[PDB]
C-alpha cells in the first residue's frame, strides 16, 4: 500500500497499463533513445515490480519509483557520450536530477516525419505480432508529443488495436486506414495541443491560475451542483493534472481513475448528462468525464446585484479569506453565463478583484464598488464584435484565402517571428474559423476563444525557446488571459527593417507538381510570408493580386511540359513583380 508504491502502482493499474504508462514515460524523458533499448529497460523495470510484489521486503522495492525510473534512465543512452548535457544532470542526485530531466525535454525534435507504409503491409505486421506494433505505436506517438496526457494515449492506443483488429481482414484495407487513422490522428494532434496548454499555463503562472481555470470550467459544466462538490472535484482535478505535468506518470492514471469512480458514484448531485456513458470501460469512461456537454442551469437564481455588491461587509468577508470569495464568485458567475469563454470569466473575475481592491478602503467603499457590474459590458463586447468580424471575413473568403489573410496579419503584427512556425501558427488560426464558425451565435465565443488561445500557446512555446522579437516574449510572459487580447490589439511594426531579396528562395520547381496540395498550400504560404517580410507596406490588395497569379502560372505551368519554359516565366514575373512592389 503507502510502503513500496511499486506495488501500490502496480495492484491498481495492473500489468498491461504499468507497462504501457512506464514505456510512454520512458520514451517521454529520451527522446532519441532506440525503440529496442527502451523496451529492454520496460521489460526489467516490470519484472523488478513482480519481485517486488511478489514480496514486500526487498530493500530495493522501500525507495520511490522516482528514483528508481531515474536510476534505469541512466543505465543507457544518457552516460553514453550522447546527450553531453543530459550526462552532467545524470550524475546529479534527485531531486535535481528529475529537474533536469523536465527541464530538458524538446517540444519540436528534429526528428523524421512518420513514414506510414503500405497498408497491407502495414497491418500484416499487427497480424504478426500485435503487441509489438502497439508497443511502437505508444513510442512514435509519445516522441513527438513529450508533454501528451497518457491517459488518452493508453485511450487511443487501445481503439487503434481495435480498429486493426476490426477491419485489417475483413474487406477493403484502405477503407478503415484512411478515414479512421486520419481522424485518430487529427484526435491526438487536439489533445496534444489541448495538454500542452494546461502544462505550459501550470508550470508558467503556480496552481492558482489552474485552479482558477478548473473552477470555471467546471461551474460551466456543472452548474447544478453545490461549491463544496466544485470544489472538491477542482482539487482532484488539479492534483490529477499536477501529477502528469510533473512526470509523475503512474500515480497521475491511478488517481484519475480514483476521479472518475468517484464522479459516477456521485452523478446524482454533480449533474445528469454522466448517466449515458459510466456503464463502460474505465478509459472511455474517463474520456467522457473530461469531455461531457454542458447541463442546464438551475431555474431562476439570484441576479448576483445582492450578493456582491449590496453587502455592507462584502470585503470584510473578502480580506477573511480572499481565495475562498474569489472561487465563490467566480462559480456563481461562471454557473449563471455557460456561453461566456473561460478565459474572459477568468478576466472578469481578475477586474472584480482589482477594483474591489482599488475601493474598499476610501471613505465610502458602496460608491466606488456600486458600478463594477457596469464595467463587464467592454470586456465582453471586444470578443463578441470580433469573431463575429472574424466570421463575416471567413464565410465569404474560404478556408485557404482566410489562411492567407490571417497570415498577411499575423506577418503584420509580428514580423520577426520564423517563418515555419508563423506559417504553422496562422494555419491553426484559420482552421479555428474552420472548424467553430458554423455554430450558432450563442456557442462560437467558447470554442472560438479556446482555440485561439490553445494556437497562441503554441505559437509562444514554440518561440519562447528562440527569443527573437521584442514583443511575442513580452506579453506571451505578461498574464494567461491576456494572449489573445495582445495579438488582436498589437500594432503594425514600423520599427522593422525590410529584409534582403533572394530570388532563390521565391523560385518554384517540379517539387509544387509532384507533391500534395497540403505541401503546395505550404510553400505558396512560405513564399507569401517571404514576400511580405521583404515588403512589409506593400497593401492587401497588392498581396491578394500577387498571390492571385502566383496561383495562375503554378496552375498554368505545372501540368505541361518542357518545364524549363515555366522557369523562365516565373523568373520574369518575379522581375515583374518586385518592380511592382
Given at each position: ?6 506495488a ?24 532519441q533513445?532506440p525503440f529496442?533499448?527502451?523496451v529492454?529497460?520496460?521489460n526489467?523495470?516490470?519484472?523488478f515490480?513482480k519481485?517486488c510484489?511478489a ?13 528508481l525510473?531515474?536510476?534505469?534512465l541512466?543505465t543507457?543512452?544518457?552516460l553514453?557520450?550522447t546527450?553531453?548535457e ?9 531531486p535535481?536530477?528529475?529537474?533536469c ?5 524538446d ?7 512518420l ?5 497491407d ?7 504478426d ?9 505508444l513510442?512514435?506517438?509519445?516522441r ?9 494515449l493508453?485511450?487511443?492506443?487501445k481503439r ?13 484495407k ?9 481522424e485518430?490522428?487529427?484526435?491526438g ?6 495538454q ?8 508558467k ?11 470555471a ?37 491511478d ?9 459516477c458514484?456521485?452523478?446524482?448531485s454533480?449533474?445528469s ?27 431562476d ?7 456582491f ?11 477573511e479569506?480572499?481565495?475562498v ?8 458567475y ?6 461566456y ?9 481578475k ?6 481592491e ?6 465610502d467603499?458602496?460608491e ?11 470586456l ?8 463575429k ?19 498577411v496579419?499575423?506577418?503584420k503584427k509580428?514580423?520577426?517571428v ?10 491553426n ?5 474552420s ?7 450563442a456557442?462560437?465565443?467558447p ?7 490553445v494556437?497562441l500557446?503554441?505559437?509562444?512555446v ?18 494567461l ?11 503594425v511594426?514600423?520599427t522593422?527593417?525590410?529584409k ?8 518554384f520547381h517540379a517539387?509544387?507538381?509532384?507533391l500534395?496540395?497540403?505541401e ?5 504560404q ?8 521583404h ?19 503554378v496552375?498554368?505551368?505545372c ?9 523562365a516565366?516565373?523568373?520574369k514575373?518575379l522581375?515583374?513583380a518586385?518592380?511592382?512592389?
Amino acid at each position: 500500500a503507502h510502503k513500496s508504491e511499486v506495488a501500490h502502482r502496480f495492484k491498481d493499474l495492473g500489468e498491461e497499463n504499468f507497462k504501457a504508462l512506464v514505456l510512454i514515460a520512458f520514451a517521454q524523458y529520451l527522446q532519441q533513445c532506440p525503440f529496442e533499448d527502451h523496451v529492454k529497460l520496460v521489460n526489467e523495470v516490470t519484472e523488478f515490480a513482480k519481485t517486488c510484489v511478489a514480496d514486500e521486503s526487498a530493500e530495493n522495492c522501500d525507495k520511490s519509483l522516482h528514483t528508481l525510473f531515474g536510476d534505469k534512465l541512466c543505465t543507457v543512452a544518457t552516460l553514453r557520450e550522447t546527450y553531453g548535457e543530459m550526462a552532467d544532470c545524470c550524475a546529479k542526485q534527485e531531486p535535481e536530477r528529475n529537474e533536469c530531466f523536465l527541464q530538458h525535454k524538446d517540444d519540436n525534435p528534429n526528428l523524421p516525419r512518420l513514414v506510414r507504409p503500405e497498408v497491407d503491409v502495414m497491418c500484416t505486421a499487427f497480424h504478426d505480432n500485435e503487441e509489438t506494433f502497439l508497443k511502437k505505436y505508444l513510442y512514435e506517438i509519445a516522441r513527438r508529443h513529450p508533454y501528451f496526457y497518457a491517459p488518452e494515449l493508453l485511450f487511443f492506443a487501445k481503439r487503434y488495436k481495435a480498429a486493426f483488429t476490426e477491419c485489417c481482414q475483413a474487406a477493403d484495407k484502405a477503407a478503415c486506414l484512411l478515414p479512421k487513422l486520419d481522424e485518430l490522428r487529427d484526435e491526438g494532434k487536439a489533445s496534444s495541443a489541448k495538454q500542452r496548454l494546461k502544462c505550459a499555463s501550470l508550470q508558467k503562472f503556480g496552481e492558482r491560475a489552474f485552479k482558477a481555470w478548473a473552477v470555471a470550467r467546471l461551474s460551466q459544466r456543472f452548474p447544478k451542483a453545490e461549491f463544496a462538490e466544485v470544489s472538491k472535484l477542482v482539487t482532484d482535478l488539479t492534483k490529477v493534472h499536477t501529477e502528469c505535468c510533473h512526470g509523475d506518470l503512474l500515480e497521475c492514471a491511478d488517481d484519475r481513475a480514483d476521479l472518475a469512480k468517484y464522479i459516477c458514484e456521485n452523478q446524482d448531485s454533480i449533474s445528469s448528462k454522466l448517466k449515458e456513458c459510466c456503464e463502460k470501460p474505465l478509459l472511455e469512461k474517463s474520456h467522457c468525464i473530461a469531455e461531457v456537454e454542458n447541463d442546464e442551469m438551475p431555474a431562476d437564481l439570484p441576479s448576483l446585484a445582492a450578493d456582491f455588491v449590496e453587502s455592507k461587509d462584502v470585503c470584510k468577508n473578502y480580506a477573511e479569506a480572499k481565495d475562498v470569495f474569489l472561487g465563490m464568485f467566480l462559480y456563481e458567475y461562471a454557473r449563471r453565463h455557460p456561453d461566456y469563454s473561460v478565459v474572459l470569466l477568468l478576466r472578469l473575475a481578475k477586474t472584480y478583484e482589482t477594483t474591489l481592491e482599488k475601493c474598499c478602503a476610501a471613505a465610502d467603499p458602496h460608491e466606488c464598488y456600486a458600478k463594477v457590474f457596469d464595467e463587464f459590458k467592454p470586456l465582453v463586447e471586444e470578443p463578441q464584435n470580433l469573431i463575429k468580424q472574424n466570421c463575416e471575413l471567413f464565410e465569404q473568403l474560404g478556408e485557404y484565402k482566410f489562411q492567407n489573410a490571417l497570415l498577411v496579419r499575423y506577418t503584420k503584427k509580428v514580423p520577426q517571428v520564423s517563418t515555419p512556425t508563423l506559417v504553422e501558427v496562422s494555419r491553426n488560426l484559420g482552421k479555428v474559423g474552420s472548424k467553430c464558425c458554423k455554430h450558432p451565435e450563442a456557442k462560437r465565443m467558447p470554442c472560438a476563444e479556446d482555440y485561439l488561445s490553445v494556437v497562441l500557446n503554441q505559437l509562444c512555446v514554440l518561440h519562447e525557446k528562440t527569443p527573437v522579437s521584442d514583443r511575442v516574449t513580452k506579453c506571451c510572459t505578461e498574464s494567461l488571459v491576456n494572449r489573445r487580447p495582445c495579438f488582436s490589439a498589437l500594432e503594425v511594426d514600423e520599427t522593422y527593417v525590410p529584409k534582403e531579396f533572394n530570388a532563390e528562395t521565391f523560385t518554384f520547381h517540379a517539387d509544387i507538381c509532384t507533391l500534395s496540395e497540403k505541401e503546395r498550400q505550404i510553400k505558396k504560404q512560405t513564399a507569401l510570408v517571404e514576400l511580405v517580410k521583404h515588403k512589409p507596406k506593400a497593401t492587401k490588395e497588392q498581396l491578394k493580386a500577387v498571390m492571385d497569379d502566383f496561383a495562375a502560372f503554378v496552375e498554368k505551368c505545372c501540368k505541361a511540359d518542357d518545364k524549363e519554359t515555366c522557369f523562365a516565366e516565373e523568373g520574369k514575373k518575379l522581375v515583374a513583380a518586385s518592380q511592382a512592389a
